[model samples]
Structure formats: C-alpha cells, structure tokens
Target chain A: FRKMAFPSGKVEGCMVQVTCGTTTLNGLWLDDVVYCPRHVICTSEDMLNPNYEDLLIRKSNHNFLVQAGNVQLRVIGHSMQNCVLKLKVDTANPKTPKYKFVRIQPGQTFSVLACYNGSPSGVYQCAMRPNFTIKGSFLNGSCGSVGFNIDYDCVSFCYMHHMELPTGVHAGTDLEGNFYGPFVDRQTAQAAGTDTTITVNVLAWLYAAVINGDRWFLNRFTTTLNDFNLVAMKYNYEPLTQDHVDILGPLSAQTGIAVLDMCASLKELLQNGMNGRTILGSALLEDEFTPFDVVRQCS
Target chain B: SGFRKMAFPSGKVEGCMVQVTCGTTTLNGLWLDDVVYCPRHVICTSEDMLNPNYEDLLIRKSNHNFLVQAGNVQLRVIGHSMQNCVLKLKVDTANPKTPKYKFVRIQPGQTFSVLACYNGSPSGVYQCAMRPNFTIKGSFLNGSCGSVGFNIDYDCVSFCYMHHMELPTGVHAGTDLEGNFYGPFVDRQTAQAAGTDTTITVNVLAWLYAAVINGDRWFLNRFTTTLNDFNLVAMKYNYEPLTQDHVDILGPLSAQTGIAVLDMCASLKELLQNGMNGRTILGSALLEDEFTPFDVVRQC
Candidate 1:
C-alpha cells in the first residue's frame, strides 16, 4: 500500500517483492530466501507448509473455494522490539479498509490479506515486508537468509472480489508522467549519491525464462532479488495473475507488440528524468534489460 | 580474499567475470576437507598393483592438506532432472559441528567459488561419491506406496584421490657409475587412466586479457568427465609447456610409458583450477604468484 504507489487515487490489493541487501526492523529478519514465483496457490498458508511443494504439483491453480483470513484488507500484524510492522492505505476513503498486516512469533507461521478501498474497483498491487533483526547477515546487514528456504508469498491467492484498474495508467502521476527522485530501487528519491549517477544492476533473466517457455511460470514483480534474497523493493503493482489478464489478455494478439511500445515509452521517459535530475547517465544493455517504466497495453 | 567488501561497478554484467581468487593447501595431512595433494607411496613392480582409476581415488586418503587459495566456496544447490552420482556432504557450521551427510546429487555442471588467503597449506584427499544411478523393479506394497519401495543402485568411483606415479628404481650390478641419477630413476611411471576411462576437455573462450592467452596455445592435454559424478575431471596432465620440457631429458613420447611425475599438480580440475592454465583462484603457493600484485611496487 505505501510502497506499492497507485495512480494518485483509490488502490488496493496485496503483493510483496523478493529484495536484496540487509535491513531489518527487529530480531525476526527475512534472511535471503529464494523462491520460484510461479505455481499459484489457494492459501497463503500453503507457502509455509513444506508439503506445499507436493501440494503445488497436485494443484497448479488457485481454488477459489478456499478463503483465507490474511486475504482481508486493513490487516494488522504485531511486533515487539525485535519486529516492527507499518501498514498504510491510500484509498482516500477512510471508511474502507484495503491495507492489512499480520505478525506471528519467529518460526511461527501466519498470513494476512485485504480488499480494495475505492474504485471503479481498481486493480491494486500489494507490498509486504517482514522486518525483523537477526544476528547474522546475508548480503549487507543482519537479515534472515536461510534455505529449503521458506517464508514467501504467505498465500498465493486469486482475488475473491473483482476490482480492476484500466490499462496504461501511471503509477504516481498522470499518464504522461514526470517521476522524481523516488524512483530508484531500494530507496525513495535518490537524485544524487556520488555526483556520478547511482546505478543499480538488474538481472534481466527473471522474465525471459517464462517468455521463452524455459520456466514453469513468470515471476513476482519481474525480478531475481538479484541473488541477494529477502531484498525489499517498491513499484507500481503490475499484477501478473490471470486476474491481471483483465488488463493483459484482450491485448493478447497485440501482446508482443505492446511490450515493445511500452519499452520505448519508458526508456524515453527515464532518460529524460535522469538527465533532468542528473540521476546519472547509466548505459543500458541495448538488447537486454528492457526498462521498467514501460506502458504496456491490451487490444 | 575478494570479500570483506565487494562492489559492482556497472548496472549489468553479461558474461562470467571472476572477481576473487581461491585455493586449498594441505596441513597436518588434513586439508580444507578436500585432498588436493595426497602422498603417493613408492610402488614396487614385484608387488601386487591395481589399475590406477577413480575407485583408487575413493578410499586412498593418503593424509595431506588442501587450501582454498584459489577459490574457497561452499554453496548448496538442488538437482533438477537428475540421474546418477551421489556424494554425502554434511552441512555443519558454528553450532552443530557435525551434521548428517546428506546424499547430494551431481548435476551436469554445478559450481560455486570462494576466496581464500595466500598462506601455504597443503590440500588433501576430498571425499566425493561418484555414484552411478539405476532403477529397480517394484510392485505396490499391499496396494499402497511403501517407503523404500523404489530401488536405486549406488555405484561409487573405483579409486580414491588422484593417483600418482611411482616408478621402481632399476636394479644395480654394483659396477655402475655414479652421476647415475637417470639410471636409479630409470623407469619413471606416469598416472594412467584404467579401464573405461574417459578424457576431460578444458576450453577457455575468454580470460582477463583478450589477446594474451590463446585457446590451444596455453592449455593442458585432454581431461575426463566421470560417467556418474557429472563432473568434468582432468585425466592426465598433457601440456606443450610441461611436455616439451620433460621430453628434452625424460626422453621422447613413449606409448611404452605413462605421463609425467609431479605431486604438486593433478589432472583433475576441481571447478576451481582452470586446469589448463595451471592456476587456482583459491589460496596456494603458485596461487600467490598468480594474484596479489603490488599496488605501487618494490622500488617505491
């Protein structure tokens, strides 16, 4: 809700990102945890159960019949000195609850969810982060980076309510937008770091495997956590769920074409912002790493 | 050691870029768990001799040391679409010093790198199961899936550790002259690949310097890959550099004899040593010379 910036209006939904680096709020840290973001589930509880791997093979799709408590909007999770959680909403309508948080003891499991506040029942992207401090560090600071590796996508669910956003809408501004300093990965408004534009290396292989049929499914927020697992990231929600087809499918035949169109738009927009803000002139791999500020369309 | 601190200069790296160096050395006959340089006993021709093979490398813990001077690494990976090979490597650390040795499957090419210091420690015998996989006939136990219902054949590598050559000293008649260094050591035996042995191939498409090191120009001879381990292993040390020097005095190519004689190096590449380059990223004697250049230099 807070990091998942919507287009300056009503927005709701739950989502999370696999990030790199080490920054935790309390003792309960999110060390580097690896996951294959595809293979949807009917319950957030599904992710915690080791049996989920077997359950995943048995069920490749979400079973709408099962409703999870964490799926509710305006959820709250508790935290002590070791863990702190902040839940925010931008629905503008105080009466509606579209943001929620849930917390359980370390090693103890739990899930949380929420619904859209206002709309045209807008499509919302959720961002969840487990902030707990740990004694050891994964990449940078002390975070929970373990293996067999569990604790992600508390519940991979399908929306019980149909709330969708129109295609081609911007994240925090008008369609033809101007993104300021708050566009950098891992931070808000990083206009200047070293006079030499701050550059973040992004692996482009996340979505390629899916697009090319090499991977079983696409990823969450199209990222690899840069191999640093448990890294937190923020972005305008780009739902890849079949529900996402609400904005994606109709443009199926034009799907390939839309990818190109959006890539071009975002590239130009980014160059302009970076130049104006002196963010840094980082050269991109021309054929790879297509910019993220793209404007994809359906039909 | 490449870490303690690390930095990424660009936003993206397209190909393989080795940042740190690592290696292993032997000390107290106990290496970093891997036996890079095990002691080779002098074998007499009159005594019973078994063929030099991996099965020999398996149980032969000649007690030595191995340093991660070139590339010290400990990374865990799962096998997908796996078949054949199983070595139990225990994952133990600060707390539980001795964990169970879980069977690890060998993927086609699984690798990880680490950085070690330049101290001189000897590497020793590394225990890895070169298991061959096979399926077994099964029937439903009482109509339900039973534990251990499925069968698997755990084929292990025949030998242990890298085999070294031990040529017997030629017998003397007493009247033979001294300066006879070549005579006493007349029959030099090289490590030979026994039955069904395969050769390993090490190819370097790129390196730090684009033009300085060419492919075939600075490479070792054919290496081998194990049928079960899925690991590309160096079979014998074949190099123009080493060969040319040996032939000058060791005599010309002899199908009659096996390869060279040296305990410092081995034909087996550990995913660490770019074998052909005779180098390691982990720490070692030679590894020190390969890396860690003076920032400003001696004269200054």
Candidate 2:
C-alpha cells in the first residue's frame, strides 16, 4: 500500500516545471524560460497551461540607512529575448506598493534611473523579469545573475545624509575561488574604516555597472565635484514669491532650518564663484564612493 | 615539308600522317587543288631555323593560313590529330586517379569502375566513384562553430561549496537563472564551541529553491526543479508569455532567463555578461550587496 501510494509519487513539483515558457512573436518556441509559482498543472515534463505573472523585485541596498537619491542602475546582461528591469521601490514598509521596474537586453548595460520620488526616505530596489514571462526552469549547467546600486552617494566621496543607508555590499560565487565584501555588517565596515589598514575588495568586473571603474564617462563627473552637490549647494530656503510665500509649506525665516541652516550662511562659499571651504555640512548623505573615515568627519 | 591537307594515303601524302581536313584546300605534295595547278610548295629548313646568321641554309617560322603562308604557315587547331599513333580520347572510366580524369552526369544505372580498390569499402567506394556517375548531397554543417563558457567559482569559501545551492542568506538570488551555488561566504560561521563539535554553514541571505523564481530563491528553486521540458533545457525558448511586445524574438530558455533577470529577482544576463572576466571571481552584484576585496583577502 505504501509503495503504490507514496512511493510512486515524487515531489509535487520537482524542478522548474515552467508553466509559462518564453515564446517568439512568430509563435515559435524558444528555450529561455523563467521559473515562477502558482501553476495549476505544473509537472516535471510539460506545462499543461500557465497564467500571467506579477512583477518581482529585489533591493540591492538592504538597510534603510542609505539615502534615496537619483540612482543610476546599470543593467548588464543578455536576453534570449527582450526584458524589462523592474525596480521594487518601497521603504521597508510592507503595506505599500513594493515594486517598480526597468528593462534591458543581453550584453547590454544601462543607467540614468530614478528611484521612488514621492515616498519618505526609505529602502528601495529592483528585480528583473520578462515583461510577459509566465514560467521558468533550471537545467544543470551554469547561470549567473546580478543587480548593482547606482546611487551617486556610494562612489562620489560626497558628504553623508541625515541617516545612512547600509552602503551597498555583496557576497557570492567567485569564478576561480575568491570572495569579497558582505561588508554592511558594522564590524567589517569598521575594519575597513581604518585608513592605515586598507581592505582590498575583489569585485567582479560588474563594478563597471556601478562606478564603471574602467569607464571614464561616469567617473570623470565625480573626479571634479561631490556627488551630493548635484542638488544641495544651497543651505537656506528663501521665499521667492509673494502668493506662494514661504509658509509652513516651504521654509520660513522663522523656522530653524530657514533662520539657522548654513546653506544661507555658507551659500556664497559653495557657490561656483565663492571658491571657499566649510567646517560642517547640513545634509549627511553622499552620492559617490568616499572614504568612510573622511565621511565621518564631514561635520 | 609544306603541307595543306595533312593525312595518310592522301595520293601518297605519306603513310606517317593520318586523315586531316581543313577549311581552305587539299594540297597533295606540291599542288593546291583549289587553286587548280599551282604546284604545291616544297618547304625546307637550314640547320638553324628563323636565323639569317646561318644563311648558308635558312629556315623560317610556319605562319598564316595560305595568305600569310603566301608568307608563312599559320598554326591552327582544326581538330584532334592522331597521326601514325592512334590517340585514345575515350573516358578513363577505368582510371580516375590520372591527371586527365574528369566526370560528367550520366543516365540512371550507368556502370563505372576503378583500376584498383573497388571492393566496396567507403574509401574504395569513393575510389570507384571517381570514374562512375552518381547523385548525392550528404555533406552538411557537421562541425561545431564556436562556443564560450562561464565557470564561476569565487573565494576560499568556494573550496567548501558547489554551484547549485539555495540563495544563502546574505547572498542574493535570482530566478531567471539557476546556477547560484558557488559562495564566497557573506558571513563565514565556521566556529566550533569549546565543548561542541558542531559548525554552522548557513548562508546569511540565500533562499534555496529549485524551480520557478517567485521571490526568494526557495520558491524559485522549487518552481524550476518541478519544471519538466527537454526543450527548455535545450535553451530553445525566448518570448513574453500571453502576448506582449518583442515576442518570438528569442528561444524560450533565453526569454525566461532574460525576463526573470529583468524583473530584478537576480540578473542572469547581467552576471553572465558583466564583471570579472577572471576564472574565479568574487561577484555578488545584487542590490545593497557590496563586495569589497577585503572579504577575499583571507587565507586562501
């Protein structure tokens, strides 16, 4: 009885019995399939049928510490077909919409992306998927995937924000046999914080997807100014109009930020013509790669 | 000797020469039959032909049809000339290996043979085939063109792991692709308690799944493993399901992997095409995952 009943039955779903395999416009079949769940008749061999799927996202900056700024996520990969890069933009908050997306192609890298613009400061990220992907599977060969953070704060050597998002970090397979940062953990970051004790991070070439180490186009910008300088040169908020006066809606001379903030005190110094230096900064967030030790002293 | 109609038994035109036909006229000995009674010219050569230096006897180049021969003999290839030796110009159906060998299409069932080695082995078949006539088109694209492989194994921790493990905690995972096993540990927990012999080998952030990519690697792994399609394994898939733009442009496997990665679960295409071209590399380009070289600086 046991042999006939349970013995013959294998796991309900063993491998990726893809419900919705990728197809071609001509109605021909392609081999590229993404594996997902909720297939009514998912078996080991064929997909009886499949339904449409929702967008999935993964956050690269896990800790809500990293500030949300203009993030340029560069996607580098090939698609047996076309696909979109869906960014799941949400704070650690679970009640709100957790996903947004973007798209790219095989052997291609793209950037110039914006993150959640309206949400209060929070954690945000992206996941990749075929726009119309229904299902997927895994044969026993090799498959590698990645998602990198493009926010300027990490690489620009800029000042920090009010609170810091966990600096982007990574951990995984090394083609030969080497591992690098999983560095967000405070201990590791502290160890790396030592200027005298320089830590060597063996990152895959995908680093180009970030600062584009070998690529000069993106690096040249940071070499000149601070990453946060893109928008924060002004420290004080002044009412420019009468009808839309600086009420509680905006900043008022009476408010602590308006009367006390240094953008006004030091605005001339940070100006293109001022040619000056400052002993402290108002915002604590950075956009590019800065020495953590120096960042700590931006006060 | 000056000759027009060069042939044998031609009014005793010399038995050494065989039959010959020309467009102008038939000259026997010294007479041109077309010109009536013009005595056929007698030609002679000195010890050195074409050189007046040996004028004691003079010879000149044969040139012209009668007009230039009115100045000299004109060389022309009218037809095959066997002369006293009968020239055999038939098909060398017996010897295709010869320099003169050539073949032409023949009717059905035409017999052909070789001088040697026609016993019917493959090589012998070709050998006999040289002389025979046949129809066949069997040589197709039968060899590999080119291929590239990505063998990723990173860090000292890779010494302790393989390439198909679940997405370990601290390690990010993607669904479109299924080869996330190699791990340079995000957090190496290889410590043994003073009195205990147990060690912890958990991935700080990996969701191990086998089939489809739901969210965590667990669900994806489960989904993918349950999948059963020889075609998908072959990577012959690539399309958006249920209708969308850019469909049927790629094989299903390519589309699935590409799309799953696009959804940002884990970028299969990005990892496959980007980053360290090195054989063993430390790459965990997932969101918020920073891979500094320090983690890999530990003892190999």
Candidate 3:
C-alpha cells in the first residue's frame, strides 16, 4: 500500500513544468492527460473548476525538457508528431499493470477520479506517467518535452459500482453512464429494452427515409437527435451504445447542425473535444434520456 | 301636302286658366309646347278676369275671337298674359321662307324637330322660360338650336306649369334671375325643428350665363340650369378648402339629379345667417360669365 506522490504539495494531484527556449509552461495532470493553464495553474487549496476555458492547452509549437519534482525527461517534437514520450510504469506494482499514452491537445480537462483503479482494502497509489510530448526546434537547435505528469489516488471513485438488478442487466456508473439502462423495475427495464432496440431501428429507418427522399422523417430525426443530445447534456453523460459516427454518418448529409467527419471514430470524436463539451455535444442539443416519442414512432 | 289636324277635346290655356274642349279629351292647360286651333270664334280671358283672388292683372282677356281655320296654332304669352290670341293659319304649299313658331317641349337632352313650315332651313328666335319669370331667348340658324333647345326640351314648361303658381312644400332655395339669394324657405314647423348639424336636402338652382363670340357681336346665352348643372358646396368642420378640381368636374350634369351637401360643420347654417357677406369655405361649380348660386336647406 503506497500513497501517490503529490509533488506540487497538492493532495490528490501532481504538477508538471516544461521549458522550451525561454518559455515555461505549467499544467496539472489528471485522467491520463495534461491540461496546461492559460495563466496560472489552480493551487492545491483551490477546487478544480474543469469548465474554465483557459486550463485546456490548445496546441504546442515548441520542444524542451519536462520536469516533475526531481523527475526530469528531455524530449522534442511538435504536436503533429505521434506519442513522443512513454510512461515507464513500475512493473512490480500490480495496481497499475497496464498504461498507455493519451494524445493531448486544446480541449483536455481535469478528471478527479481517472486514476482510481485499486481495490477498497489495498493501499491506493496512482501510476506516474508522462501523458503527451512535443518535439520541435528549440533554442538548442532540437529538443523534446513531455506535456504533463499524472499521479493521483487510486482508491477514490467519483461513481458508484454497477449493480445487476433482478432482470440480470447491469445498471449503474460506467464510462458512458447508465445510458443503455437496465431499470430495477421490470416494466421500466422492458421500456428501456424497447429504447435499446428501437434506437438503432429508428435511426436506421430515418436513414432509409432520407435515402428514399422522404424529408419528413429526416426532419423528425434531426429534432430527436437534438432532443436526445439535450437529455445527455442534462444528465452530464453521453448516450448511444453504438458508435456515434455509425449512427450519425448517413444522416449527417441532411442535418441542419454541423456533423463531424462521417469516418471519424468515437475515439477521435471524443479526443478532438469540440470546444469544452465533446464533438457529440457540438452536434446535438443538451439534455438526458431518450424521448419516448422517439421509441413511440418506431412502434 | 296634306294637313294633320289635331283637335283639343278639353284643356286649360297657358297663363290663362280658360279650358277648351272638343269632345271627351280636355285641354287642362295650355302648356309651353301646346299647339292649339280655334274653329270660328273663342273668347280667352285672363285668370284675373275669371278669378277675383288674382292681384295685379297677371293676365288680360282677348279683345276679339281667336280664329285659326284647320291649321296648327301658336300662342305668344308675355309676362302673365297671352299677347296674341288671334293668329292666322297659312297653307304649307311651297318651300316657305315664312318663319312659323313651333312650341316644342325641349327636355334637358332632347333634340327638337325642325318645324315643317320652315322647310328644314328654319331660322328664328326661340324663348325658353321657367316658372313665373326665368326666361332665356336665343336665335337659331339653319334650324339648329343650342342650350335654349335643351331648356324647352326639358322641365322648362313643366316646372313653370307645376311650380310657378304653387308655393314650395318644403325648404326650397334657388337664385332669382337677378342672382339674388332666395329662400331656404321652410314652413314654420321645419324652421323650428332645424338643428345646427342636421343633414338637409337642398333644392339648388345655379344659373349659368355664357357669352358667345358670334360675328362681331357677343351673343349672350343663358342655360336652363337643372339639378344636373349645379354642384353642392360642402365644407368640413375644420373649414378646409375644398378641391377646386372636384368643384370644376361637377359642372353641367351629375349622374344623379339631386346634389347633397353635409352641414356637419354648421357652416352652411352660418352662411344662411350671414348671407353673401360671410366669407366661408365650401364647394361649387365652373362655367362662363357668372352663376346665380341658390341653395335650399332642409333635413334629410
């Protein structure tokens, strides 16, 4: 049982500083990504406000050495280059058995409970990692620098565990939330089962309707998507069990709102981060829950 | 040429109330266009000689028996009396130059037939009179008559015969020949009930005098003005000046015979009180030399 390092003297957090030429960039690392502050990074006592626009690093143009307390790594490259740095995990630490580098850009925000992976009885310790790196020309001709460092409590969970109801469907907190829900009441679960089945069917019918040149369903589908997005935003979660690009791909041609690339993967969709709210948030209006009308029309 | 004889069974003579009769049909009165014939002898007398209610010798008796043998007869009545009662009948044999008077009733828009005696080349002075004294005399050339023909063609004879001796029933207003403003004449009851803003039907007679420039002489012609010829002047309460173009277009004839003006402003009532001395805003007409404007105000 080990406590995660809080090098910036901030509990449940770690700070990184990168220097390229004469410029020094400071950021806080969380959720396997580094978020650079536009001015000063929020101190340990200050509660993290994730909605602040400036905390998200837009793009890196320089390269240099990255430092987190006594740990230092020197690297180089621009933001266009692939993962320039890798986190050397403590192989012996069974809690952090697997790790990967997440690409960082303009819209990454701090997540408090991202590193929470240990059991309740175990001593919580977050694996330290260099999230992203920049490599490009520097004052010393060529250099590379890691963006931010991640090390936080592994025991703290912001979400409750998923519970299997009598219907045998797991219902609770997951990465996508309980969007594909399994209700405790069998009747409500049956209703949600209809939503799960009809969601794809209605979207498919709407796509076919557009293909058959029937604009009425397209119009209704656009409204439903907007309404669905509103519900997702209200609940602060994303809906859709299937990839959004597949669901939104065909209908994107006739939609009134801007749709991201038809070929964009869900990973890319989430990674690009349209403004602060994701690409899905950009494409649809805010709220949570699928409208019954959406499922009603399918029947 | 053969003669067309028309006998009067029974009728009254014009100006004189003498009734002449042949059989069943009676000559009720000698109207302006009446053509009459007396067989051997007939004594025509004035209404004064017949009735005692007559004042000021309006008509005089015939001094002799009026004679006309099987021929169209014409009567010349001046002022209130028949001037010539005995007239000679001439045979229409040749194309005669002799100008014979044919008293034809000419309406507002009527074309009078040329007298056969004048052989279609008739030339003579024609006189059209309305009521007791409103008369216009004009000479015609080559059987062509102008506005005087319109006068005789229309209500000239009828208006005189019906209204000259009879008093008006309602509030009546018209101008005399001298252009003097006469009654808004109403009965005692009507004048008492009149209000400041009451809408009234006004009898308007606007006289038009046109002076024609004919061969070294300006022949003055007076039109036999009807309701068609007059435009009723209307004023707003704010005393706004009426459109002159509208007033000008209203001359000579209107689609409907009556001319109506609203006294919503009571300006007309004011005009009645102050007479011609009052300067006011209203609407009226366009014409030649002058117009004897007359208006009769009564509740609508």
Candidate 4:
C-alpha cells in the first residue's frame, strides 16, 4: 500500500489569499480544467480497461466465492461526469445476463454486488453509458470473456486511496490553518447550489422560521417565494420548486431547534479557518453567493 | 338652434349610468363607461355610475365622439357653494365655446340652466365629479351608494346661485362665469399655479378709494390721511414714494355691486387690468369685478 502525499508543509505553486489573520490558496487549474486541490487526475493512463477511456475507473476490488458459486464485484466509480455504469455478469448458461445498473451523479460514486447459480465461470461484462436510457453503450470491457479465470482464495484490489482529512478540512495551510480560499469544504458548505437545487436563502428562511422561534416571520418569509412565483409566472420565468414545502413540515414541528444546531454546525464546518493568520470576520451571508468565502458576517 | 337634447332611446340614462346600447341587443346597450357618469354622477343618481363600480362598465367611450352643445353667450350661475363641487362638462377646455347639447353640472347641485342656442361637434371630454359631500358606499366590491347624490341639480344650483345677492364675505373663492375656481389662495402664485385666476379681498374703506377720488370731503379727508400715513410708513421702509397706483390698489376693494368705481386714470386702470390678468403679481380689476382681475381678463 502506497500512502498519498498530505500537505506536509507550505503548498507551493498555487495562488493564496490572506484576510485579517487567515490565509487561503487557489486550487490548481490544468489549463481549462480545474482539478481538485490535490489534482485527483483520472486520465487514460490511470484507467484499468483501455477501451473504456471515458469511464475513468478510479479503482476496483474483486472477490470470488467459488464454492458458493457467487462472484462479488465492487466497483468504485469516480464520478468525473454525469452518467451511469451498467455492471453485468454472464454465467454463459442459457438465459442472457440481466445486468444491474447503478447511477452515478457528478462528484459522487456508487457500487453493486451480484451472484451466480452454479460455478462462477462466466464472463463479467460491464458497459458504461452517459445516462440510463436505451441509448447504445459508449464504452465497455470484460474480465472473463475468453475463459473463466478466478483465483478462489485470492483477493485482488487496486486503488489509489486518498488520505482522508477531517470532514471539513481542506488542502494547503498557513501557520494558523488550512489555506482559506477556494479550498473550503463542500460537504459542509451550504453556500449557493448551482441552479434550482438548494440555496442559502432557503436556509436562512428555515433558520428564521423554525429555529428563531417565530411562526410569523417564517410564514411570511416562506410565502415570499410563492409571491416571487407570481411575478415569475407573469413573465414566464422559472419559479421556486415545492422542495421548500419539505422544510415547512419541520417548521411546523416542535423542537425543530435540532435542525438549527445542525445547520449552524454546517456553517461552522465550512467556515473553519477564519481567524488566525490572515482571516478575520464572522462567516455570514456568504451562503447567498457561490465560491463561499469567510465573509464578515453582516452585523 | 337654442339647445337640442339628442336623446337616443338607446342613449339610456339610468340613475348615474348613461349609455347607448345601439348595436348590441344587450339594451344593456353599449353602456357608457362609468367614468362618463361619474362626473356629476351623484346628481344623476346611483353608485353604478361611478368607478369601483369599475370593470364591466365600459368607461371608454373611445368609439363615441358623443358630445352635446351650449352657447358662447353662456350664463354661469355663480355659487360660492359649488366651488368645490366635483364638476364635469363636455367642452374643449383648451378653447371653450358653446358646450355640446348636453351639459354637465356639479354639486350642492344648484342654480339654473339658461338655454343658449348653438351647435358644435361633440368630441372633447366632459368633466365629471362625485364631489366631497358624496362618498362611495358599500365594500369596494359589490358596493352600493353610501353617500347618495343628495339633491337635484337645478335645485342645488338654484339655492347656491340664486339667493346670493352678493359674493360671500369671508372668502371670495368660487367659480368664474366659465365655472373655473379661484381659490382660497394665500397668494397670486398659488391661484395661478392652479391655472385659474386670483382674487384679492380688501376692506370697505380702501374699496371706496377705488371708485372715488373727489367725492365727500370727509371721505376724501380720511382717504388722503390714510394715503399720507401709508406713504410715510412705506417711505420709511423703502425710499420709494407712493403714486396713484398705490391708492389704485392699496385700498380695500369695493364690496358693493354697480357702485361707481372712483374712475381710475388709465395707468392705474391698465395696471389693475394687466396685474390681475397675470401681467404681474399685484391685484387688479373694477367695481362689479366680484371675481379677481385675472378672472375678468382671462375670461376676455
């Protein structure tokens, strides 16, 4: 097992920003493409199957229970793009292999397992499609196509495991903390979502409606989106969706205070390296905009 | 032709509503929009004739150049009472002549209508009002007449214009013969801003000076004494001496009707005439000039 390099000292050759006493750095961009801070590269050289160049198969593990006639395939799909992977197994018997498919959203991964009736001697075929439709497969690969090959007692695993930092930590740092620029934690960031998915405006409203203990402001605030929809409908613009309605239930509940705590915890986690080296400011309405910053909370 | 009432059977007048439903069998005729009836709407009767009272009421008579006529030699009943009445009539305000056959009236509704015969095409907008004394009744929707048109038009006009042998004392503000209002104005500029004339109210002693320069010795003595005192005081303030222009306007206006205006010299006369007609800020005009000098000149 080889260990991935953690940010041992000062991360070199990247842009950095320092506010009051906190510092941040810009992630690397390979020309037009912006790579993750550590540059998680998934090029043709890193893939297992040459034919499936586009799939960017990050890593995988295979195990065979020969006696039980079961083959377990664990595929760690790196979601470089928006698409799905169809993993199939053929016993090479009578009926066609009805493969099971797994959907992989952008920046996320998925896995699947399967079984056979008799000996696990059939080929393992997997096809990757841009999406789940009757569309023809883009690229594909097989393991046991020529002849069944299984090492019953052997465990084969190939991976370039990333060093796991704390849930809200980022790459690079100053003497005080993680470099506080574009490296803020996305998992903990309630910063603006791309399109219609979710927004900080909703979060703020939720905090006001449920946590702040005011049904009056909440009722009016929530309906404001509906009011906005009225204007939107007039001009034929896109409207806010019913997803906000989901927040209404919790708002109508007692002790929704828990959600507020969680929401704050999220804000805290994303706004971690704010006050030491060069950063100073309360992280506030930064959520309203994208590329969330350690903003001086609106006092 | 004195005055002709071109009433169409379809030209229905119901309460406040008046419309001609000619082509549409909805005799429920093409309804005259509520806005049409709204002015002087109170006098005709009914809340349906006013807006809010909106919608379904075709206020747009855009299709109808529908008009009525009255003559240039018109008799306007001066009513101190009708000054604020929501009044509307159909005549080219840009250049008013004889009105179309049908004329509009305002409220406290009064006086008399003298028939002057004349003819002109009806195209201009008719002034309409519901006046302050009246108010819309009921909820904004499904409303009924809350404050009704209290009285009949001719009767209100009769009482407002008939009994007043002279202008009211406290305020000279009222409609000119053309039915334009000269206010309860603080100054000429205020009245002029309204696109109307301005009036000056003065005390009786000063008014006698307007008509008489050499009459009763006692009257002349006091007039001279007052002028001398005013000049002395005025000279103390500004270095300027007083002229006949001072007595021409400085005295209180004559309150009496048809009383001789102590004939002023042409300069004083021209000064008052020009000043009142907005020549300058100072007040002007003659005896029987119950209205402001601006009123007499603007009317001319």
Regions of model 4 farther than 4 Å from truth: A1-299, B1-207, B222-300
Model 3's DockQ score? 0.00
Q: Candidate 2, residues B1-300: lDDT per residue as tens digits?
A: 000100000111111111111223222111111111111111212222223232221133222222211112222322221211111111112221112111132221111211101011001010000110112111101010000011112210001111111121211111101112112311112331121111111110111111122222321221221122321321322211111221222124233343332232222223323532332212111211111111112111
Question: In candidate 4 chain B, where is summed lDDT lowest over 10 consecutive residues?
Answer: B1-10
C-alpha DockQ of every model: 0.01, 0.01, 0.00, 0.00
- Model 3 Cα shift for residue A219 (angstroms): 99
Best by TM-score: 1
Model 4 residue A14 CA deviation (Å) reads 99
Lowest summed lDDT across 10 adjacent residues in model 1 chain B is found at B142-151
Across A262-287, the per-residue lDDT of candidate 1 in tens digits comes to 33333343334323221111222111
Error of 3 at A60 (Å): 99
TM-score, ranked from best to worst: 1, 4, 3, 2
Number of clashing pairs, model 2? 170
Candidate 1's docking class is incorrect
User: Which of the CAPRI classes, incorrect, acceptable, medium or high, describes model 2?
Assistant: incorrect
Q: lDDT values of the candidates?
A: 0.19, 0.17, 0.24, 0.22
lDDT of 4 by residue, B122-191 (tens): 1111111121222111111111111111112211211111000112121122232223332332211122
**TM-score of chain A for each candidate?**
0.17, 0.17, 0.21, 0.23
lDDT of 3 by residue, B1-300 (tens): 000111111001112122232222122222222332211112222322233322222223332222222123333332122222211222222212212223333211111211101111111111222211222211121212111121121112221111111122211222221222222322121222211322111212121111111011121222222222222333322222333433343343222222322211133334333443322111111111112111101000
Candidate 3, position A214, lDDT = 38
Report the C-alpha displacement of residue A25, candidate 2, in angstroms: 27
> Which ten contiguous residues of candidate 3 chain A have the minimum total lDDT?
A114-123
